[PDB]
Design a protein around this nucleic acid. Structure first.
Ligand code: K
Ligand code: K
Ligand code: K
Ligand code: K
Ligand code: K
Ligand code: K
Ligand code: K
Ligand code: K
Ligand code: K
Ligand code: K
Ligand code: K
Ligand code: MG
Ligand code: MG
Ligand code: MG
Ligand code: MG
Ligand code: MG
Ligand code: MG
Ligand code: MG
Ligand code: MG
Ligand code: MG
Ligand code: MG
Ligand code: MG
Ligand code: MG
Ligand code: MG
Ligand code: MG
Ligand code: MG
Ligand code: MG
Ligand code: MG
Ligand code: MG
Ligand code: MG
Ligand code: MG
Ligand code: MG
Ligand code: MG
Ligand code: MG
Ligand code: MG
Ligand code: MG
Ligand code: MG
Ligand code: MG
Ligand code: MG
Ligand code: MG
Ligand code: MG
Ligand code: MG
Ligand code: MG
Ligand code: MG
Ligand code: MG
Ligand code: MG
Ligand code: MG
Ligand code: MG
Lengths: 91, 102, 65, 61
RNA sequence: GCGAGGUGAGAGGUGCCCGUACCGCAAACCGACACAGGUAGGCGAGGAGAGAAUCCUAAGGUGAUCGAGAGAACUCUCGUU
RNA sequence: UGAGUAGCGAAAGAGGGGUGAGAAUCCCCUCCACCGAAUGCCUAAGGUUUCCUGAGGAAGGCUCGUCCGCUCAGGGUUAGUCGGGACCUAAGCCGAGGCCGAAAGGCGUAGGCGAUGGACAACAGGUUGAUAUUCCUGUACCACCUCCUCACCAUUUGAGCA
RNA sequence: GAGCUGUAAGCAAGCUUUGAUCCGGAGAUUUCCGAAUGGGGAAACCCACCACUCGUAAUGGAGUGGUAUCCAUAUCUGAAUUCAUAGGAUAUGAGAAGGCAGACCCGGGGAACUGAAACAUCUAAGUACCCGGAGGAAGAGAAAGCAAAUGCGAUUCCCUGAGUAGCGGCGAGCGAAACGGGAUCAGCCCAAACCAAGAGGCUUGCCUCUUGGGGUUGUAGGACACUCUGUAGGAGUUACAAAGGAACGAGGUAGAUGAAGAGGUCUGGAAAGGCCCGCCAUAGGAGGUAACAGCCCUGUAGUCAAAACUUCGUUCUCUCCUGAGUGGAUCCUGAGUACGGCGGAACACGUGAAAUUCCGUCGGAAUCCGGGAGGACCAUCUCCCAAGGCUAAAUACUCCCUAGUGACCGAUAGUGAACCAGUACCGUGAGGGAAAGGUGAAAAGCACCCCGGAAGGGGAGUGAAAGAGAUCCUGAAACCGUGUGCC
């Protein structure tokens, strides 16, 4: 598969901004992607050295716009720690 | 539709019956056209960011397409619309005279 | 890029432009996430360009078989 | 099931009738006998009706 | 059985998926209810005590989702005679 | 209609200060009171975002409401070692062929599935508004791998694996 | 052919006469689950093996494809056991599987309530229901028939016969058929004798089997012999053998063209209405448009149009192919069959005087000097030739698609559902199952001011109307109020 299919988009939050000081980068990834694929994808695309990938699943949130109820998409979030001697990613 | 954006048309019905004007925009899905100077409405716009002041804006509202007819190039009278093939291209023609509208 | 222009390219040349477009599409999605992307219409354009090139590749595989 | 391999005779339904002519359902079984015969050109123990064995064309194997 | 390379120690490296929020003797679970009911298991301090009894406390938790008066009959739950 | 009637679902609050259009009811403070083999702490099942932050007050809340398990936004769940799977099997269930049966099917062997059991390597401290044997700090352990290093044994009674 | 990026406003960013959006034909892509089929599983999840590929020193990771079972065919192994066979392995299969249209059809199994004014025979009813199999239809079908004539000539369906004949605790009820009139029409292929060739049992010039030929029936036909005669005119993929191609024509799936009034004037917010005048019409279907339009728009009548796929027909091509007579030496003409007893079922027909058809069980023919039927049975006569197969049409039905119709509904009606309805909600589950349409012609959806935290209101403005201001056309009654003439 393509590396750029694995990584969907960066998570830009206050939490994720705090993680970037610790050299940790939060990505929304493909829901099927294991953490080895995420590790390989980050190293391929950005040309960095990954220390470890922690990964978590988020359920879809129940949502409403007027009468119609429904769910947001489920998400897979990867927190990618780069090694000490590594180039930073440019978000 | 029998008319399009750019055509000079006469309004044949409504309050603005008799008034000529250019079609500023066409709405094929609704069968409506916006004719310049025709069917003016006074919109009461609140202060937005896009429109900062607000106020009562005089603007054209669409009329139904069947209430306009294109002008005959010869006489200047209203005409029904036919079609002929000229140089391969289809063109609208004034049924009154014969000449090409577009 | 149109299908007539894509058919002039070789299969290896098309596949390279697919890779180039998928690099562009990735960067656009990142710019969209950060809120730096002005030209949002480009995402749809690149997606359909990828679709067009993959369509041409598959036509050649079917033509080969 | 209880089916003759040769003829296809099997259980069929009908009535018991009393003297007062009350109908109640019953079956008539075929008189099937498990015998070794050729089935696709090889010996196999299979149900054959006594009627199908009567002539002796269905050779015992 | 399998076998030309093994065994042990070091050094370097690799280690996926699912769950993880919050409630969980409860207003979030089962009881149509923010319902005196029901809901497995682990831990469960002190004094006096045989004790997880009992009363008062510790850590910790809580003051209860209508109130203010009046202090009749009657009804209920209590105390005394 | 009954009728402004019955009811408002076990329980201790009081005052001061604050916020606000509005306060018995929200916040803070003080003292008082209640539970304490629980009314505490942890954790199943089940629920499924109810969690945290900011904003809100129509409805829901048996009153009120500035408040809320409610409404609107945005956020939050990090594991080689915890629990489950890439391990094991019990009851039972499924079941190649097979046996049986008007049909549908019933039964059952090999073989599987199936925890409530067996097996199995990580601990202490710290940290956020919201996660923590998961993140961070320190110090570990388990399985597997060989670009490498060292020692030892051995190339057909020939190590070793099994 | 000029707009467009759907509901859906809105900003945003874009696209489009170098032809977009949009419409039709043919393709491509088509996650995961599901027959679900690599194995497992609490559907939409988990875990593999084998190739090849990416990646790593390597392990771990990733991608693509293959990997169910049964069946068929072929090949290779071949147990106990000698040969074998069972079994195993591998390969080739657009082979099967599952679904549904709650319909129609054919089978297997098969109620009860109910009726009989009770109830058991009987009825309901071979219905409902379950199960299997289909097919576009199915089933039936080319006389062992109907009948009783100077006969008919496959089947099916409609009318009629007829509520007759009959059946029937002769109760309740059940209830034909043929003739006659119509729709539609079409007939065929085998098995056997025999011939030829080959194969394996030699049973040893006999027998069995497999191909091809031959042959197809009833006042008998065929084999067999005779003499004829054809070997390419006739037939054909709807049976009668079975594939394929071209051409031409007419349809289907997008479309194109298309006559005549802004006539004047009057009300009006608006004119399609009134009044007074024209005009078109193979077009006065319809819908829309500011009130009711043949002449305003979309259209309509008529006439055209298809790159592509598709349906039908036709012609050619293609493919296939002797059919008449005369003789009776023998031979052949469907066997565990017909039929019978016993037990049931089906026939309108309930065991009866009970033919006829089918099932189980047992018994069991004749075979042309033969056999069956004509409502017990026998004789005579008449009609026919079973125990093999195929066969269009007329007939049934409609989840659908296209066009249209209604002395059908018009929001408690009509579908359960005009609306995001099999939803919400209820139930462990099967399953049950709602309510809810209307601003205006156009959002012109009330700028601004005032009271109020808001809600809400009063002005102002828009509009024909705001007492049309958002479950916003009309707006009854119950019910709730304010005022007060009389008591
Ligand atoms: K947690
Ligand atoms: K106690
Ligand atoms: K609040
Ligand atoms: K009955
Ligand atoms: K009765
Ligand atoms: K009009
Ligand atoms: K009879
Ligand atoms: K019999
Ligand atoms: K006859
Ligand atoms: K209804
Ligand atoms: K009054
Ligand atoms: Mg995890
Ligand atoms: Mg016209
Ligand atoms: Mg927690
Ligand atoms: Mg409770
Ligand atoms: Mg003590
Ligand atoms: Mg104690
Ligand atoms: Mg006393
Ligand atoms: Mg009172
Ligand atoms: Mg009272
Ligand atoms: Mg009272
Ligand atoms: Mg009271
Ligand atoms: Mg209370
Ligand atoms: Mg106490
Ligand atoms: Mg909270
Ligand atoms: Mg309240
Ligand atoms: Mg474990
Ligand atoms: Mg079983
Ligand atoms: Mg089986
Ligand atoms: Mg367990
Ligand atoms: Mg452990
Ligand atoms: Mg917490
Ligand atoms: Mg009765
Ligand atoms: Mg058919
Ligand atoms: Mg079919
Ligand atoms: Mg048929
Ligand atoms: Mg045929
Ligand atoms: Mg036209
Ligand atoms: Mg006029
Ligand atoms: Mg009107
Ligand atoms: Mg015959
Ligand atoms: Mg007779
Ligand atoms: Mg109504
Ligand atoms: Mg209705
Ligand atoms: Mg439920
Ligand atoms: Mg009114
Ligand atoms: Mg109206
Ligand atoms: Mg109204």
């Amino acid at each position: 598969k393509d590396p750029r299919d694995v990584l969907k988009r960066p998570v830009i939050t206050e939490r994720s901004a705090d993680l970037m000081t610790e050299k940790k980068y939060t990505f929304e990834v493909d829901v099927r992607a294991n953490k080895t694929e995420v590790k390989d994808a980050v190293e391929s695309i950005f040309g960095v050295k990954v220390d470890k990938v922690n990964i978590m699943n988020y359920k879809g949130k129940s949502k409403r716009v007027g009468r119609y109820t429904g769910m947001t998409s489920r998400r897979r979030k990867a927190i990618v720690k780069l090694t000490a001697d590594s180039k930073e990613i440019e978000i | 539709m029998h008319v399009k954006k750019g055509d000079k048309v006469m309004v044949i019905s409504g309050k603005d019956k008799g008034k000529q004007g250019t079609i500023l925009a066409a709405f094929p899905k609704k069968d409506r056209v916006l004719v310049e100077g025709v069917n003016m409405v006074k919109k009461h716009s609140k202060p937005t960011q896009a429109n900062p002041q607000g106020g009562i804006s005089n603007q054209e509202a669409p009329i139904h397409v069947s209430n306009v007819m294109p002008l005959d190039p010869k006489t200047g009278e209203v005409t029904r619309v036919g079609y002929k093939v000229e140089d391969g291209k289809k063109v609208r023609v004034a049924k009154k005279s014969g000449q090409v509208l577009d | 890029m149109k299908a007539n222009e894509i058919r002039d390219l070789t299969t290896a040349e098309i596949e390279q432009k697919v890779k180039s477009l998928k690099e562009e599409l990735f960067n656009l999605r990142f710019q969209l996430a950060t809120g730096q992307l002005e030209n949002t219409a480009r995402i749809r354009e690149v997606r359909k360009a990828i679709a067009r090139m993959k369509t041409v590749i598959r036509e050649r595989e079917i033509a080969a078989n | 099931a209880r089916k003759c391999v040769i003829t296809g005779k099997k259980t069929t339904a009908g009535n018991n009738r009393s003297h007062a002519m009350n109908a109640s359902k019953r079956t008539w079984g075929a008189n099937l006998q498990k015998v070794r015969i050729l089935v696709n050109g090889k010996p196999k123990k299979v149900y054959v009706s006594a009627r199908a064995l009567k002539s002796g064309k269905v050779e015992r194997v």
